[PDB]
Amino acid sequence: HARLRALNGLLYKALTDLLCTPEVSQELYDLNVELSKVSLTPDFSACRAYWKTTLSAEQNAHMEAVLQRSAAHMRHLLMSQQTLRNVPPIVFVQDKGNAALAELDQLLAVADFDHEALNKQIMEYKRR
Amino acid sequence: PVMVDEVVHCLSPQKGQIFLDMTFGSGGHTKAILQKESDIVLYALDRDPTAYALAEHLSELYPKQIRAMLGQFSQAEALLMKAGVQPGTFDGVLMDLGCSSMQLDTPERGFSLRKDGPLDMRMDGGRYPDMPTAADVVNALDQQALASILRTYGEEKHAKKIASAIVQARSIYPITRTQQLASIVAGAFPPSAIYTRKDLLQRSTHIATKTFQALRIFVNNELNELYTGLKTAQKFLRPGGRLVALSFHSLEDRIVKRFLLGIAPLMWELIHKKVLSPQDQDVQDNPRGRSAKLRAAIKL
Amino acid sequence: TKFSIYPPIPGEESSLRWAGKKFEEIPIAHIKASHNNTQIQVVSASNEPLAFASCGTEGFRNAKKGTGIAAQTAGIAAAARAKQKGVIHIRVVVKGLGPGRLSAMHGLIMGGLEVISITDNTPIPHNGCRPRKARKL
Amino acid sequence: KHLKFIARTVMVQEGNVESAYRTLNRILTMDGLIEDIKHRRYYEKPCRRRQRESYERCRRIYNMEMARKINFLMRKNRADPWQGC
RNA sequence: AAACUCAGUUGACACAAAAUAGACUACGAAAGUGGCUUUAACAUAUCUGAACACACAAUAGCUAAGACCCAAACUGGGAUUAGAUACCCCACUAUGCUUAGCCCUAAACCUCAACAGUUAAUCAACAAAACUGCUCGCCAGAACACUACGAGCCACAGCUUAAAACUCAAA
Ligand SMILES: Nc1ncnc2c1ncn2[C@@H]1O[C@H](CSCC[C@H](N)C(=O)O)[C@@H](O)[C@H]1O
Numbered sequence: 001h002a003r004l005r006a007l008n009g010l011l012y013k014a015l016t017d018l019l020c021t022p023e024v025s026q027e028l029y030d031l032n033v034e035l036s037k038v039s040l041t042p043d044f045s046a047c048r049a050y051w052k053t054t055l056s057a058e059q060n061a062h063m064e065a066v067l068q069r070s071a072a073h074m075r076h077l078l079m080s081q082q083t084l085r086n087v088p089p090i091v092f093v094q095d096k097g098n099a100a101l102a103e104l105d106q107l108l109a110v111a112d113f114d115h116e117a118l119n120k121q122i123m124e125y126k127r128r
Numbered sequence: 129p130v131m132v133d134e135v136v137h138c139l140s141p142q143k144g145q146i147f148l149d150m151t152f153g154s155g156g157h158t159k160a161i162l163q164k165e166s167d168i169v170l171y172a173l174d175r176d177p178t179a180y181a182l183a184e185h186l187s188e189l190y191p192k193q194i195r196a197m198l199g200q201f202s203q204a205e206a207l208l209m210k211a212g213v214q215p216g217t218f219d220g221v222l223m224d225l226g227c228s229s230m231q232l233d234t235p236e237r238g239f240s241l242r243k244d245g246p247l248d249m250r251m252d253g254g255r256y257p258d259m260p261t262a263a264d265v266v267n268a269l270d271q272q273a274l275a276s277i278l279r280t281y282g283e284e285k286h287a288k289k290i291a292s293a294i295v296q297a298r299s300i301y302p303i304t305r306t307q308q309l310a311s312i313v314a315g316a317f318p319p320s321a322i323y324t325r326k327d328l329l330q331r332s333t334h335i336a337t338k339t340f341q342a343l344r345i346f347v348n349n350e351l352n353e354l355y356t357g358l359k360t361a362q363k364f365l366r367p368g369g370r371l372v373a374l375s376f377h378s379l380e381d382r383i384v385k386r387f388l389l390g391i392a393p394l395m396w397e398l399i400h401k402k403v404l405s406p407q408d409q410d411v412q413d414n415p416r417g418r419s420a421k422l423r424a425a426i427k428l
Numbered sequence: 429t430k431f432s433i434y435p436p437i438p439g440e441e442s443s444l445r446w447a448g449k450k451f452e453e454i455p456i457a458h459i460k461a462s463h464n465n466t467q468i469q470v471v472s473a474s475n476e477p478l479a480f481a482s483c484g485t486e487g488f489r490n491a492k493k494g495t496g497i498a499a500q501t502a503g504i505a506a507a508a509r510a511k512q513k514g515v516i517h518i519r520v521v522v523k524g525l526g527p528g529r530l531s532a533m534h535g536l537i538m539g540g541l542e543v544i545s546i547t548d549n550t551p552i553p554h555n556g557c558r559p560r561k562a563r564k565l
Numbered sequence: 566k567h568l569k570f571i572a573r574t575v576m577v578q579e580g581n582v583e584s585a586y587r588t589l590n591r592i593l594t595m596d597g598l599i600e601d602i603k604h605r606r607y608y609e610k611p612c613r614r615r616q617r618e619s620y621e622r623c624r625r626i627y628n629m630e631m632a633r634k635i636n637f638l639m640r641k642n643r644a645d646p647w648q649g650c
Numbered sequence: 651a652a653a654c655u656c657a658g659u660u661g662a663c664a665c666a667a668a669a670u671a672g673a674c675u676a677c678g679a680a681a682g683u684g685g686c687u688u689u690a691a692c693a694u695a696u697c698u699g700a701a702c703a704c705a706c707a708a709u710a711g712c713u714a715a716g717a718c719c720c721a722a723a724c725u726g727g728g729a730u731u732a733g734a735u736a737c738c739c740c741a742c743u744a745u746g747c748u749u750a751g752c753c754c755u756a757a758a759c760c761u762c763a764a765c766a767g768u769u770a771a772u773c774a775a776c777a778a779a780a781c782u783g784c785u786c787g788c789c790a791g792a793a794c795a796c797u798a799c800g801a802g803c804c805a806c807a808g809c810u811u812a813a814a815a816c817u818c819a820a821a
């Protein structure tokens with residue numbers, strides 16, 4: 001739906017601007033979190049921000065924990081900036097899609113080489 | 129001819145130019161075009177054999193300047209290939225949609241619910257006897273099929289109710305008359321709801337008008353055949369030729385708009401950016417042509 | 429001694445030099461990072477324009493202008509033009525909070541020019557013209 | 566009308582331009598300039614501003630009280646000295 | 651997309667608006683009042699006291715004359731729509747400002763009347779713990795009804811006061 005797409009783009013831009021600043025918290029800015037996309041629920045119940053995860057598992061867990069802690073504060077900041085009148089709760093979802101592409105790149109470097117349907121009923125009724 | 133002045137001005141008939149009229153019908157637009165330009169070459173195609181005979185008779189006025197042809201949009205390409213113009217090179221194409229004034233005024237054709245007629249509602253006038261009639265359509269299609277057809281073609285919100293009423297009525301007695309079907313459609317709603325629905329003109333209209341429109345479209349397959357006709361007109365039209373399409377309902381207008389806008393580089397140049405509409409006084413004079421929207425383009 | 433983030437005071441006996449020049453002599457690089465664009469202009473110490481670049485000038489159009497890559501490309505182009513005019517060290521002053529606010533700088537660094545001081549001059553009306561009403565969607 | 570390159574100016578240290586930019590951004594955040602810049606993009610109506618300020622004050626007070634309570638009760642979190650009783 | 655051929659650095663430049671302080675909780679009868687200076691100035695120590703007068707009363711609005719940054723109903727485009735409106739983008743007006751009058755409405759809400767007193771044996775519930783003394787105003791099922799009529803008003807699609815008949819066993 002067009003409105004959902006526009007809202008997704010606006011929220012993605014706003015969140016990207018938010019995370020490029022120490023505004024939310026110094027630790028979150030130091031984490032230098034990136035986003036791949038932002039998707040809204042069809043019923044506007046929640047806003048899922050898909051953040052890219054690094055290779056380090058412990059660093060990934062730390063970043064996810066900080067994002068979960070600061071999601072409510074970021075929602076309040078978005079509502080304060082009036083980027084959206086009613087902002088649904090923000091859920092930070094890990095994105096491991098790029099890891100699969102990276103591993104494929106690593107391994108490939110060593111890989112070797114309507115009307116007609118009812119017309120039947122109409123025909124049958126005419127014949128019958 | 130609805131918006132005859134606009135069509136004449138936009139097409140700009142000129143000497144030695146080739147023009148096609150994919151829907152002759154009454155031929156009022158064709159007659160006006162031949163009136164303005166006495167040296168124009170015109171081919172007029174229609175589905176109604178009555179309209180084909182009318183065009184043949186009117187060919188007495190213009191022996192060779194107008195050439196009549198009988199067939200659908202799908203048959204249009206084959207018939208024009210038989211004529212001998214595969215490139216076409218037509219300097220213009222005119223596509224008037226909807227139901228003919230002669231077809232609707234005649235109760236025998238069954239297009240009018242106001243005057244009782246057989247539930248034919250078939251633009252074909254005996255060329256294809258095996259073609260199903262509206263009575264066959266209503267007596268054949270199931271509840272879900274009829275509801276889907278009504279919802280998609282007549283834009284009827286209450287397609288389920290009308291379909292169920294029609295199914296019950298056909299189960300009781302066969303449905304063969306236009307007034308019978310109109311009474312069945314009215315019975316699905318309270319009697320006060322016979323004229324509750326008001327058109328965009330804010331005048332009371334029969335509640336069975338949408339059902340009749342949907343049934344006519346499904347009988348004649350107007351959407352897909354209009355798509356094929358537009359494609360054939362694009363294929364046959366001369367480069368720089370002028371295509372003028374007249375619509376009477378939202379579905380065909382949407383189809384024409386999407387085809388013109390390609391919804392890839394555009395293959396049309398809109399002569400008029402916004403859709404042209406008849407004068408309000410002209411709308412009052414011709415209530416039937418109120419919903420006639422004009423879309424004009426040049427082949428690119 | 430030790431490093432000081434505070435810029436050296438004009439008209440003061442500051443021993444710091446850059447290519448033999450004083451801080452008041454180092455050319456300036458203005459970066460206006462608007463919400464959908466990034467315009468970069470290099471001027472001398474005497475406000476003499478030397479290089480100008482922007483996402484539109486680089487060929488990016490519409491939303492492509494409001495991207496960090498476009499800002500980096502504009503920075504690289506402006507840095508190349510300034511280097512062709514003899515610019516090495518620059519004081520960067522940036523206004524606005526556009527997406528390219530940092531990215532342009534990176535491009536301006538990739539062109540070979542050295543940034544000696546990062547300055548913010550974002551227009552902040554203490555309270556001036558009333559801003560537009562909040563968008564509703 | 567003020568002198569240039571004094572306000573919101575950070576000198577880069579040995580070329581760590583990224584670090585200098587992060588320091589300047591932290592300074593702007595601490596001084597609240599970023600908040601003002603982003604909140605002045607659109608006009609916040611006075612009633613909305615008052616509601617937001619009251620909510621922020623209440624949230625800050627509640628967070629401080631909760632943190633103080635947690636810190637005060639953290640002393641009890643030692644190992645159990647009376648295990649089995 | 652439309653439209654501007656303007657955009658950027660620097661300089662000059664308001665009758666508009668009043669970052670941070672303000673995480674303060676002050677002033678005023680309330681409405682309200684958060685840039686700076688100066689002048690004038692914040693009633694009554696004995697309480698209460700207006701359909702019964704005097705004087706106020708945010709925003710919106712009217713009348714007249716100005717001011718033009720920005721904002722902005724309305725309108726005109728741009729997209730979008732089958733088409734049209736709304737939302738989004740652009741331009742722009744009444745209007746927000748000043749002067750001089752009007753209008754006298756707000757969820758004008760701490761939704762908890764003014765004054766005095768008590769913390770003793772708690773209190774339907776929820777809200778802001780429970781009461782006492784005293785005074786003024788107001789209420790007596792819902793709906794009809796921020797209505798009709800009458801009257802008053804600088805008000806003329808207005809405000810204030812404010813019913814009845816029919817109907818319901820609820821609200
Ligand atoms: N797919 C199709 N192919 C050929 N003729 C068609 C057609 N669909 C409709 N027609 C015919 O074209 C007309 C459509 S409406 C009538 C318009 C006509 N120009 C007039 O003024 O009379 C009808 O006469 C109908 O019979």
Ligand SMILES: [K+]
Binds near residue numbers: 554555668669685
């Ligand atoms: K101020």
Ligand SMILES: [Mg+2]
Binds near residue numbers: 699
């Ligand atoms: Mg008194």
Ligand SMILES: [Mg+2]
Binds near residue numbers: 700
């Ligand atoms: Mg009083």
Ligand SMILES: [Mg+2]
Binds near residue numbers: 707754
């Ligand atoms: Mg007032």
Ligand SMILES: [Mg+2]
């Ligand atoms: Mg006023």
Ligand SMILES: [Mg+2]
């Ligand atoms: Mg404006």
Ligand SMILES: [Mg+2]
């Ligand atoms: Mg108030």
Ligand SMILES: [Mg+2]
Binds near residue numbers: 763764786
């Ligand atoms: Mg009182």
Ligand SMILES: [Mg+2]
Binds near residue numbers: 796
């Ligand atoms: Mg009222």
Ligand SMILES: [Mg+2]
């Ligand atoms: Mg009244």
Ligand SMILES: [Mg+2]
């Ligand atoms: Mg009266």
